[PDB]
């Protein structure tokens, strides 16, 4: 079999993954699961799969330990940064599913990499924030990364085996990769006007909120752009976007003979997770298959970059390097929270992000060696900390009109 | 480099192929070209590429030899069945492009197979008429077959390398192939009624007339169905059809996790031919790439099998085996000629084909061993000869009302 650890097990990615595990008892054993906030769900999961370890936040450690004992469970309870690292570097773990969202997840993904683990990557931060470092660390120690997000996974499925196994192979001209194409639904304001977009908020949210806001601004796709440059070892000019409201075509690889290879699917994350889990093999995933007879019509159009400024910004960030990508993201974080808490207009998200990318204070730190074996991570998190301060300030100043 | 022979070099497939050759002098040398009717074009081609051999029909051998001499050309002139076989089995030929359409091409494709040649298959008859024999012969002697028709080539691109190399691997469950999907444009009477379809003829004809008629009846797709069963080693139930009027999606492979892999392209045959030529490598093909920004909307719907009876018939033929497939095709041939010469209605094509599949006279020969190393080919051509007689009779009887 294969011993698994799911970092961030109480959300969507966790549900989908564990559903497959149930259908495949004989292939995948759970060794560890984690959850920062959702203690009862974490507990429920623990009672079901009997993991050798679990981890939660520092604040919840005591309650969780008390609960774990009140249930008569053999399971070790960890907490915080340290517990994530232990689980990700554990010698009894063969495969890690990195599903923690946010800067708090980097150290464990880096750890899985350090320890040579198979990694099923399911958060954007690992490569948006720690791009060079994650990839360098994986190569050095022989980790394997396999993307789970729908777009990256489609691209990965549509690339020849040699490039799947060694992403730097994409540069040998014989494989004839010309460019990658990311599809994007255009979010909830595709058909609405530039003027209707300056307004809120249940409208903007209609399916998690932040990610749904990112879909409506198109920051999600810029982020995926930055991730793709690292995942598949390209620069941004080689990766283009097409809008595709239906979201049936998950992405495409263009080859130099004119062949576009593409993955089509439903939204069900069990498809990409099953592919990644069983790679190079395939297994039943338990999804309701896409019905080719009921697609009606798949629309495609060019992205309106004036409306979708976050996408231009992200590409601008990708050109500059790890520093501005750190800034792009952290700023988006603060700016999205702001909109959700009704402090800004939807269109200000981009105004704010731009302001931070340009800030003289932020730029002095771009030239730093964020890829460094030894101080890389410190410098990333320091940069993250700095940009929240500035982004927060920026939101303040925007409101008065500065 | 790689020595090539193009059987049937004066049509579309020939043009497209030779265009790629020109862009790639350093990779592909022409050793032979053939052409049954188009003597001057054949000659023009000969004067350009300086082939070591050419072949034409028996009737045109003399004029062509005279012309070849009047041009001061070193080239050997062959003719008929024998000349095709010589070219296809020639030790100086590494790769054969089987582009001859019609029963007259089988012996040379079998010969290429017998001699261990790489074959770029570009006619339907080889597998529709000589399915088991072609595939058995190729395996025994180590020929490699690579389809060039747009649908089969898309499927082939979308199948893992091990199944590309050995089509019987599609049965190991680890590769997780669930089913193949052929796309079909629905031809020129998709939106028109069952009643408007009973009428002709420039309408039915708006590549060639026959193939365009086959598109309008959907016999082309039934034929492709039968070919796919042999190419990819499946039975017909495992291969489904979806109508797709835009013809951007050339076909899809469905995997057990819900992943549909697909090839998108323009109609330009240089795409599939370049893929097949360079396999496993890729090369520039010289096409105007598909423009993802100008697709507007790709429609998909289920095939209307009442209107598209030829498709039901072909699947019925595929169930029975090589005999009924021979009959299906030969009958279609005669029935299409008939329509083109204004002897029948478009809808009678299916009436006629059905009549022949069901004919007691034809059925006695189904149980024959059409796959036999030694008498296989004789029995196929004999069956072809027989079905023209019957189909011709059938057309006669239909007109009076019997
Ligand atoms: O993996 C799926 N997503 O990240 C959701 C994509 C929605 P979008 O195409 O609007 O970015
Ligand atoms: O490869 C190209 N063709 O076979 C033409 C397909 C037209 P159709 O889908 O109507 O059979
Ligand atoms: Mg995504
Ligand atoms: Mg075709």
Strands B95-98 and B118-121: parallel
User: Which residues in chain A are contacts of B296 at CB distance < 8 A?
Assistant: 299-300
Q: Give dist(CA B144, CA B135) in Å, integer.
A: 10
Buried b (16+ CB within 10 A) or exposed e, B344-366: bbbbbbbebbbbbbebeebeebb
| Contact between A259 and B275 using a beta-carbon 8 Å cutoff | yes
Q: Map residue A390 onto helix, strand or coil.
A: helix
Measure the CA angle with vertex A260, ends A177 and A242; round to 5°.
100
Q: Map residue A389 onto helix, strand or coil.
A: helix
Domains of chain B listed by start with CATH number: 1-149 (3.40.50.720), 150-304 (no CATH), 305-402 (1.10.1740.10)
A302 at B interface, C-beta within 8 A: yes
Q: Is B268 in the pocket of ligand 2 (CB under 6 A)?
A: no
| Contact between B258 and A287 using a beta-carbon 8 Å cutoff | yes
Q: To which residue do tokens 């069983």 refer?
A: A278
Q: Give dist(CA B11, CA B208) in Å, integer.
A: 10
Q: Give dist(CA B381, CA B369) in Å, integer.
A: 13
Of A121, A111, A170, nearest to A145 by C-alpha is A121
Asked if A14 and A99 count as a contact pair (C-beta separation under 8 A), the reply is yes
User: Which residues in chain A are contacts of B300 at CB distance < 8 A?
Assistant: 292-293, 295-298
Q: Is B107 in the pocket of ligand 2 (CB under 6 A)?
A: no
| Contact between A282 and B174 using a beta-carbon 8 Å cutoff | yes
Q: Give dist(CA B388, CA B402) in Å, integer.
A: 18
Radius of gyration in angstroms for the set of CA atoms belonging to chain A, rounded to a whole number: 21
Asked if B107 and B129 count as a contact pair (C-beta separation under 8 A), the reply is no
B262, B278, B289: residue with CB nearest A258: B289
Ligand nearest to the CA of B265: 2
Q: Give dist(CA B377, CA B399) in Å, integer.
A: 33
Asked if A87 and A6 count as a contact pair (C-beta separation under 8 A), the reply is no
Strands B118-121 and B144-147: parallel
Q: Dihedral angle at the C-alpha atoms of B210, B211, B216, B221, nearest 10 degrees?
A: 140
Q: Give dist(CA B138, CA B233) in Å, integer.
A: 13
Residue A303 main-chain phi, psi, to 5 deg: -65, 125
* Cα separation values, A143 from A115, A120, A399, Å: 7, 10, 46
* Cα separation values, B294 from A237, A260, A316, B183, B383, Å: 20, 15, 26, 20, 48
Asked if A270 and A285 count as a contact pair (C-beta separation under 8 A), the reply is yes
The two most distant CA atoms of chain A are separated, in Å, by: 64
B171 at A interface, C-beta within 8 A: no
> How distant is the Cα of B360 from the closest Cα of chain A, in angstroms?
37
Asked if B118 and B94 count as a contact pair (C-beta separation under 8 A), the reply is yes
Cβ of B188: how many Cβ atoms within 10 Å? 17
Angle between helices B309-320 and B219-231 in degrees, nearest 10: 30
DSSP line for A309-336: HHHHHHHHHHHH-HHHHHHHHHHHHHHH
DSSP line for A77-122: EEEHHHHHHHHHH-TT--EEEE---SGGGHHHHHHHHHTT-EEEE-
CA dihedral sign, ordered B373, B375, B381, B384: negative
Given in angstroms, what resolution was this structure solved at?
A: 2.2
Strands B28-34 and B2-7: parallel
Residues lying with their CB under 5 A of ligand 4, a single-atom ion: B 149-151
Q: Give dist(CA A248, CA A266) in Å, integer.
A: 6
Residue B303 burial (10 A CB sphere; 0-12, 13-18, 19+):
buried
Residue A380 main-chain phi, psi, to 5 deg: -65, -55
Cα(B331) to centroid(ligand 2), Å: 20
User: Which residues in chain B are contacts of A299 at CB distance < 8 A?
Assistant: 296-297
* Cα separation values, B189 from A250, B245, B257, B346, Å: 32, 11, 36, 11
Q: Give dist(CA A318, CA A331) in Å, integer.
A: 15
The helix (run of H) or strand (run of E) holding residue B121 is strand B118-121
CA A331 distance to own-chain centroid: 16
Q: How many CB pairs under 8 A join A and B?
A: 149
Q: What is the DSSP letter of B301?
A: B
The token pair at A220 is 């999600």
| Contact between A259 and B242 using a beta-carbon 8 Å cutoff | no
Residue A255 main-chain phi, psi, to 5 deg: -105, 160
> How distant is the Cα of A134 from the closest Cα of chain B, in angstroms?
28
DSSP line for B45-66: HHHHH--SEEEE-STTHHHHHH
The helix (run of H) or strand (run of E) holding residue B11 is none
Residue B239 main-chain phi, psi, to 5 deg: -140, 120
| Contact between B300 and A292 using a beta-carbon 8 Å cutoff | yes
Q: Map residue B260 onto helix, strand or coil.
A: strand
Q: Is the peptide bond before B280 cis (omega within 30 degrees of 0)?
A: yes
Q: What is the DSSP letter of A30?
A: E
| Contact between B261 and A266 using a beta-carbon 8 Å cutoff | no
Q: Map residue B377 onto helix, strand or coil.
A: helix
Q: Map residue B354 onto helix, strand or coil.
A: helix
- Strands of the sheet with B118-121, listed across from one edge: B76-79, B53-56, B28-34, B2-7, B95-98, B118-121, B144-147
Of A69, A71, A17, A9, nearest to A35 by C-alpha is A9
């Amino acid at each position: 079999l294969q011993s698994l650890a799911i970092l961030g097990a109480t959300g969507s990615i966790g549900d989908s993954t564990l559903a497959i595990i149930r259908q495949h008892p004989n292939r995948y054993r759970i060794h560890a699961l984690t959850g920062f906030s959702r203690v009862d769900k974490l507990l429920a999961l623990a009672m079901e799969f009997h993991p050798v370890k679990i981890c939660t936040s520092p604040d919840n450690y005591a309650q969780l330990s008390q609960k774990v004992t009140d249930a008569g469970l053999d399971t070790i309870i960890l907490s915080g940064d340290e517990g994530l690292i232990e689980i990700a570097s554990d010698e009894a773990v063969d495969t890690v599913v990195a599903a923690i969202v946010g800067a708090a997840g980097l150290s464990s993904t880096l750890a899985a990499a350090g320890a040579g683990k198979r990694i099923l990557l399911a958060n954007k931060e690992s490569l948006v924030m720690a791009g060079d470092l994650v990839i360098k660390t994986a190569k050095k120690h022989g980790a394997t990364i396999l993307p789970i997000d729908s777009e990256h996974n489609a691209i990965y499925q549509c690339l020849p085996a040699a490039i799947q196994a060694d992403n730097t192979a994409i540069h040998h001209t014989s494989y004839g990769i010309k460019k990658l194409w990311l599809t994007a639904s255009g979010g909830s304001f595709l058909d609405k006007s530039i003027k209707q977009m300056q307004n809120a908020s249940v409208k903007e949210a209609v399916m998690g909120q932040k990610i749904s806001i990112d879909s409506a601004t198109m920051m999600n796709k810029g982020l995926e752009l930055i991730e793709a440059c690292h995942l598949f070892d390209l620069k941004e000019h080689q990766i283009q976007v097409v809008i595709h409201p239906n979201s049936v075509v998950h992405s495409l690889v263009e080859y130099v003979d004119g062949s576009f290879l593409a993955q089509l699917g439903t939204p069900d994350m069990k498809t990409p997770i099953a592919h990644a889990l069983a790679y190079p093999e395939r297994i039943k995933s338990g999804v309701m298959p896409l019905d080719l007879y009921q697609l009606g019509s798949l629309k495609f159009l060019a992205p309106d970059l004036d409306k979708f400024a976050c996408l231009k910004l992200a590409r601008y960030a990708a050109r500059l390097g790890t520093g501005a990508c750190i800034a792009l993201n952290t700023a988006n974080e603060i700016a999205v929270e702001a909109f959700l808490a009704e402090k800004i207009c939807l269109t200000d998200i981009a105004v704010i992000v731009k302001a931070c990318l340009d800030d003289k204070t932020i730029a002095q730190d771009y030239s730093q060696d964020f890829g460094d074996e030894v101080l890389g991570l410190e410098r990333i998190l320091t940069m993250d900390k700095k940009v929240r301060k500035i982004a927060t300030a920026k939101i303040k100043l925007l409101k008065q009109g500065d």
